[PDB]
Amino acid sequence: STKMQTLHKLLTGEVSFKNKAPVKDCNIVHQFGENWATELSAYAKTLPAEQQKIIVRQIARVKLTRYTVAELAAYCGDGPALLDETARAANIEQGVAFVKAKGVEAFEKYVAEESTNANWKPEEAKKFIEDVKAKAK
Amino acid sequence: ISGVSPLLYFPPTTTSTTNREDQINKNTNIAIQMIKRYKGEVPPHYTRKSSATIEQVEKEIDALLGGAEKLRKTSTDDQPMDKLTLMERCLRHALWSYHKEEGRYDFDQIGRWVVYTPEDEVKLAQLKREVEAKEKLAALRKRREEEGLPGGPVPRINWPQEYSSFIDREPVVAKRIRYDTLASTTLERDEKQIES
Amino acid sequence: SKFCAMMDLLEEMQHRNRLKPNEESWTWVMKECVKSGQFRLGYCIQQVMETECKGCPADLVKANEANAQKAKTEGKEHPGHLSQQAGLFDVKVE
Amino acid sequence: SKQLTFISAGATAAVLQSASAIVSKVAGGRVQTKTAKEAGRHAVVVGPETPIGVHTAVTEVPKSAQDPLFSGVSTVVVRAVLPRAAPDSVQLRDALDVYASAGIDTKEEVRSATEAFKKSAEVAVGKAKAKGVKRIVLVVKQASKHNCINELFKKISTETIESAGLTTEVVGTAAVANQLIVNPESLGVVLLNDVAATEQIELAFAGVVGGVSRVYHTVEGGKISAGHSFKSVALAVAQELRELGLSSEADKVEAAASKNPRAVVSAL
Amino acid sequence: RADEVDYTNLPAPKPQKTVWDDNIETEVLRKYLDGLSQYDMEEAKYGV
Predict the structure, then answer these.
(1) Where do runs of H (alpha helix) occur along A78-121?
(2) How far apart are the C-alpha atoms of E17 and D268, rounded to whole Å?
(3) Where are the bilayer-spanning segments (chain E) (predicted)?
(4) What residues in chain D have their Cβ under 8 A from chain E's Cβ atoms?
């Protein structure tokens, strides 16, 4: 009960972090858990409609916060709903340029290293590398 | 680095064609602008009262001091000096000050005919290190260019460790962007125009 | 450090066991100094072999000199912070 | 007969071509569309980069183009823009902080920066008074490098605002950016000092809201529209046409931008 | 059933000062490189 109450206050802005750190997706994931969104959504159902709407809105904004400021400015120019596809396309274009610049085997190793540092599932990394390879030809 | 990131970091190389000449030209122009501001205004022009070259003056000085070599007598540093010694010291001091201002950094004679104060010795030592350092830097920047390594400095970092250390990727990605950009630029100016 | 371990081992052998190191032991030390790039320890070991043993393997002496002159070209002859000019009140005493 | 001035600052050719097609198809040829690098009125600037001749960089949340996520939010983000010199020349924002370290005199540059900040502060307080807020939020990057430009920015912005009678709260860049993206309803008017990071924050806010057109106030006196994406540029053109005195065309462009952001030209 | 955890508490991001290789190019740029490291640490502490 306390965790959900703390999370709701944190997202609403009533409750600040110890060091007044920004309320980003990464920090929340670090403390509350990987699936904080799911448990919060289930908990919100036990609250009036207004609080439910606020929780949904705050969750959506936090998800948008998962990108850096530069990425948002570059890719979120034409709305947030189209942000994910635009970011994915730009990343794919970078992958194509990398492949055309320094081969494939190095690109395969580079993608693997970034995925390890980027906290990416092997399936997602494999899908990305296949997509960029297919885009090349 | 908790949290699945949306994108895999890739080199920020987007200006595929950035000629080294243009970068060094811009560095030169900025360097010239800063130098002009620091110095201020070019000093008012001066017209020479007499025409003579530095080489001619040095030759005349050598001729003047060569005829008195037999008469010239050495003595202890604390002992009083002679007319020939005083003339030699003054002439050589002026000559080597002019040479050092011009650019002929011959420290062997400058340390002899210009050093008379501990502050002067400190200034000479500071100058001596600087010239040698620039010569070494230019040589290795040339030897590095021949090899093909990036012109700019590269820090001794292990980004896989940095990703693990930091929690949020944003500062880490920003740091990589800066250093990658720095390593892809030539922090060199045209020293012909600067000297001019 | 490999060099430190071997020197300590020699110290144990000569002092606490009363056994004189032979040429083979010193050659191993010199090889490690050359391999690790520590060209100043090589000079000291070179004299040790020239003093206790009979000379040094001239292959290794030349290798060490090559490493030293590489540093001179690259400027890594001494740590740089030592070369920085300091003063009475310009030194940070931690 | 009439003229619309298109400025390009770091914008891809696709966006500029899209803007030209939109204006040509909507206007119908009555108003010509010329391209330049500086203007004071009837100007649309395309691209993240700041054009030459702009001192204020205000941006708001238009009611019509509010994204469903950010429905009801009302916060005005004004970025102070110092005079822009040629790309090769050292910019004032950097000269004001490096010359002091080098010991060079910094009198004229300080005077120019002071004038720009005063104008930006006057714009910010006017917006704050119009909206009715009592306190504004200054944003200054807390990096050690920018220890002089920000100091002057605070010294002047607070002076002007306090002279006007409103309160000022100073903050950094990361905290304000997170607040503006997550909880923007707690900020009424936020001024931003002239730094690259602040420019990115302004663009991110203009994009996250759903795509809007930024207003630039120039030295000559006036307002010019600014966009960086298809939707933002389309809204900027729609506002510009409205200023010229075209209402139906402006509404059509706005509706097309709302419906089909990336392909407004074909949508309308 | 005692206290479990302060979800509010967050471990501060422990900064690390960047270290440059000791070459002649570093000595010439010692002041400039040091400024970059100071800027990097300031960014890490504040966040951006």
Answers:
(1) 83-102, 105-118
(2) 55
(3) none
(4) 142-145, 172-175, 177, 197
